[PDB]
Design a protein around this motif. Structure first.
Motif, PDB file in Angstrom:
ATOM      1  N   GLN B  66       4.127   1.796  18.058  1.00  0.00           N
ATOM      2  CA  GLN B  66       4.655   0.501  17.653  1.00  0.00           C
ATOM      3  C   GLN B  66       4.079   0.163  16.286  1.00  0.00           C
ATOM      4  O   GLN B  66       2.864   0.264  16.084  1.00  0.00           O
ATOM      5  CB  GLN B  66       4.290  -0.590  18.660  1.00  0.00           C
ATOM      6  CG  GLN B  66       4.903  -0.409  20.035  1.00  0.00           C
ATOM      7  CD  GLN B  66       4.711  -1.627  20.913  1.00  0.00           C
ATOM      8  OE1 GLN B  66       4.828  -2.761  20.452  1.00  0.00           O
ATOM      9  NE2 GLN B  66       4.410  -1.399  22.185  1.00  0.00           N
ATOM     10  N   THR B  67       4.944  -0.228  15.353  1.00  0.00           N
ATOM     11  CA  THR B  67       4.524  -0.502  13.989  1.00  0.00           C
ATOM     12  C   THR B  67       5.105  -1.819  13.498  1.00  0.00           C
ATOM     13  O   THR B  67       6.077  -2.349  14.043  1.00  0.00           O
ATOM     14  CB  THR B  67       4.952   0.611  13.019  1.00  0.00           C
ATOM     15  OG1 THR B  67       6.382   0.728  13.024  1.00  0.00           O
ATOM     16  CG2 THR B  67       4.319   1.942  13.402  1.00  0.00           C
ATOM     17  N   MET B  68       4.472  -2.338  12.452  1.00  0.00           N
ATOM     18  CA  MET B  68       4.974  -3.450  11.666  1.00  0.00           C
ATOM     19  C   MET B  68       4.859  -3.056  10.200  1.00  0.00           C
ATOM     20  O   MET B  68       4.201  -2.073   9.851  1.00  0.00           O
ATOM     21  CB  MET B  68       4.195  -4.746  11.937  1.00  0.00           C
ATOM     22  CG  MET B  68       4.367  -5.298  13.339  1.00  0.00           C
ATOM     23  SD  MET B  68       6.024  -5.947  13.626  1.00  0.00           S
ATOM     24  CE  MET B  68       5.954  -7.499  12.731  1.00  0.00           C
ATOM     25  N   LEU B  69       5.507  -3.825   9.337  1.00  0.00           N
ATOM     26  CA  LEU B  69       5.441  -3.591   7.902  1.00  0.00           C
ATOM     27  C   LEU B  69       4.453  -4.556   7.262  1.00  0.00           C
ATOM     28  O   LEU B  69       4.396  -5.734   7.624  1.00  0.00           O
ATOM     29  CB  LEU B  69       6.816  -3.755   7.253  1.00  0.00           C
ATOM     30  CG  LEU B  69       7.882  -2.738   7.663  1.00  0.00           C
ATOM     31  CD1 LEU B  69       9.165  -2.983   6.888  1.00  0.00           C
ATOM     32  CD2 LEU B  69       7.390  -1.317   7.446  1.00  0.00           C
ATOM     33  N   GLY B  70       3.665  -4.039   6.323  1.00  0.00           N
ATOM     34  CA  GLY B  70       2.775  -4.854   5.533  1.00  0.00           C
ATOM     35  C   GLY B  70       3.078  -4.678   4.058  1.00  0.00           C
ATOM     36  O   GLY B  70       3.675  -3.679   3.646  1.00  0.00           O
ATOM     37  N   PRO B  71       2.684  -5.643   3.234  1.00  0.00           N
ATOM     38  CA  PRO B  71       2.969  -5.542   1.802  1.00  0.00           C
ATOM     39  C   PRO B  71       1.994  -4.622   1.088  1.00  0.00           C
ATOM     40  O   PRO B  71       0.851  -4.429   1.510  1.00  0.00           O
ATOM     41  CB  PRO B  71       2.827  -6.988   1.312  1.00  0.00           C
ATOM     42  CG  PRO B  71       1.829  -7.596   2.238  1.00  0.00           C
ATOM     43  CD  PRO B  71       1.990  -6.900   3.573  1.00  0.00           C
ATOM     44  N   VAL B  72       2.474  -4.039  -0.006  1.00  0.00           N
ATOM     45  CA  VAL B  72       1.647  -3.217  -0.880  1.00  0.00           C
ATOM     46  C   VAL B  72       1.066  -4.142  -1.943  1.00  0.00           C
ATOM     47  O   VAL B  72       1.799  -4.676  -2.781  1.00  0.00           O
ATOM     48  CB  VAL B  72       2.452  -2.074  -1.508  1.00  0.00           C
ATOM     49  CG1 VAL B  72       1.667  -1.429  -2.645  1.00  0.00           C
ATOM     50  CG2 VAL B  72       2.823  -1.042  -0.448  1.00  0.00           C
ATOM     51  N   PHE B  73      -0.247  -4.345  -1.902  1.00  0.00           N
ATOM     52  CA  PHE B  73      -0.906  -5.252  -2.829  1.00  0.00           C
ATOM     53  C   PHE B  73      -1.078  -4.601  -4.193  1.00  0.00           C
ATOM     54  O   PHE B  73      -1.470  -3.435  -4.298  1.00  0.00           O
ATOM     55  CB  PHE B  73      -2.274  -5.669  -2.291  1.00  0.00           C
ATOM     56  CG  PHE B  73      -2.215  -6.457  -1.015  1.00  0.00           C
ATOM     57  CD1 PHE B  73      -2.567  -5.875   0.191  1.00  0.00           C
ATOM     58  CD2 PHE B  73      -1.818  -7.782  -1.023  1.00  0.00           C
ATOM     59  CE1 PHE B  73      -2.518  -6.600   1.366  1.00  0.00           C
ATOM     60  CE2 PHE B  73      -1.768  -8.512   0.149  1.00  0.00           C
ATOM     61  CZ  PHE B  73      -2.120  -7.920   1.344  1.00  0.00           C
ATOM     62  N   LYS B  74      -0.788  -5.364  -5.241  1.00  0.00           N
ATOM     63  CA  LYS B  74      -1.025  -4.932  -6.609  1.00  0.00           C
ATOM     64  C   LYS B  74      -2.325  -5.544  -7.115  1.00  0.00           C
ATOM     65  O   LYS B  74      -2.730  -6.628  -6.688  1.00  0.00           O
ATOM     66  CB  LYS B  74       0.143  -5.323  -7.517  1.00  0.00           C
ATOM     67  CG  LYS B  74       1.404  -4.523  -7.234  1.00  0.00           C
ATOM     68  CD  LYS B  74       2.506  -4.810  -8.234  1.00  0.00           C
ATOM     69  CE  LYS B  74       3.738  -3.967  -7.937  1.00  0.00           C
ATOM     70  NZ  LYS B  74       4.749  -4.029  -9.028  1.00  0.00           N
ATOM     71  N   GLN B  75      -2.981  -4.832  -8.028  1.00  0.00           N
ATOM     72  CA  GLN B  75      -4.297  -5.205  -8.534  1.00  0.00           C
ATOM     73  C   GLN B  75      -4.180  -5.479 -10.028  1.00  0.00           C
ATOM     74  O   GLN B  75      -3.887  -4.568 -10.809  1.00  0.00           O
ATOM     75  CB  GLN B  75      -5.309  -4.094  -8.249  1.00  0.00           C
ATOM     76  CG  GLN B  75      -6.708  -4.352  -8.763  1.00  0.00           C
ATOM     77  CD  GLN B  75      -7.675  -3.257  -8.354  1.00  0.00           C
ATOM     78  OE1 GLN B  75      -8.088  -3.181  -7.197  1.00  0.00           O
ATOM     79  NE2 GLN B  75      -8.033  -2.397  -9.300  1.00  0.00           N
ATOM     80  N   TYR B  76      -4.402  -6.733 -10.419  1.00  0.00           N
ATOM     81  CA  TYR B  76      -4.318  -7.159 -11.807  1.00  0.00           C
ATOM     82  C   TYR B  76      -5.688  -7.580 -12.324  1.00  0.00           C
ATOM     83  O   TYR B  76      -6.536  -8.061 -11.569  1.00  0.00           O
ATOM     84  CB  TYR B  76      -3.361  -8.345 -11.977  1.00  0.00           C
ATOM     85  CG  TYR B  76      -1.900  -8.067 -11.697  1.00  0.00           C
ATOM     86  CD1 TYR B  76      -1.427  -6.772 -11.530  1.00  0.00           C
ATOM     87  CD2 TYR B  76      -0.988  -9.112 -11.610  1.00  0.00           C
ATOM     88  CE1 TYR B  76      -0.088  -6.528 -11.280  1.00  0.00           C
ATOM     89  CE2 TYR B  76       0.349  -8.879 -11.359  1.00  0.00           C
ATOM     90  CZ  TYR B  76       0.795  -7.588 -11.195  1.00  0.00           C
ATOM     91  OH  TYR B  76       2.132  -7.361 -10.946  1.00  0.00           O
TER      92      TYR B  76
END
Lengths: 141, 141
Positions: B66-76
């Protein structure tokens, strides 16, 4: 098989692959020199301690991700319970006569009470270590 | 972009994509009929509540995940702090003049004290929602 896990989703108690071995994480720390995370875990099979640092990748501009590897759990049906071990069956019908059960957090007694209550509903989650299988958790479908 | 997360690595407070929106998880429950996990979260941008159930797959015999989607964090990088917003820069040099900072767990004051202490070492983790960017966490490299 293994699955890639982002480090910000790893907490104490999770099972990871450390130095090629499945281990329960007992300590998380951060390297002052590199920023990598270090994981100390207990080998599920031998109970020895192992440590491994996270893998840092940059798959795109402005994207830095740290990951670890976790095991892919298999789900077997429980046909019988015999003296610490169980008779399990895969989804395709492959019978495993003497599958051991890990002694962690009273799994045997939790498994025993759910089996007598609803045999057909009980499942065990199984990890593999280069040929050897062991039940490390249970599930009710 | 998104990342697949196994459900046994999701805990209260994690950020997931629910109904296409990035949300902070505030409740986890299990469906009695299907076994799926249900996630209730708070939209990081609009603060509205959303719920979504997990995706169940069987990629191989005896493997159920069982999975969910998470966001890909960007680093500034942080170049300046101006009135609630910051001037940020990507790794390739793209300058963002008015990047907003989320009001969650005193992020602005944590960011303010680390900036005056070591400007060049501070990074913000950024999420995107169909064009709009917002800083939701910080990091020290």
């Amino acid at each position: 098989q293994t699955v890639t896990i982002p480090c910000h989703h790893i907490r104490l108690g999770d099972i990871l692959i450390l130095q090629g071995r499945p281990c329960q994480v007992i300590r998380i720390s951060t390297s002052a020199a590199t920023g990598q995370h270090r994981y100390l875990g207990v080998d599920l099979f031998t109970k020895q301690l192992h440590e491994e640092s996270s893998f840092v990748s940059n798959p795109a501009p402005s994207v830095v991700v740290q990951t670890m590897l976790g095991p892919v759990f298999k789900q077997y049906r429980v046909l019988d319970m015999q003296d610490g071990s169980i008779v399990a069956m895969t989804e395709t019908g492959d019978v495993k006569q003497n599958l051991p059960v890990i002694d962690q957090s009273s799994l045997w007694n939790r498994l025993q009470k759910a089996f007598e209550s609803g045999r057909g509903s009980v499942r065990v989650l199984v990890v593999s270590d280069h040929g050897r299988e062991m039940a490390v958790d249970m599930k009710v479908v």
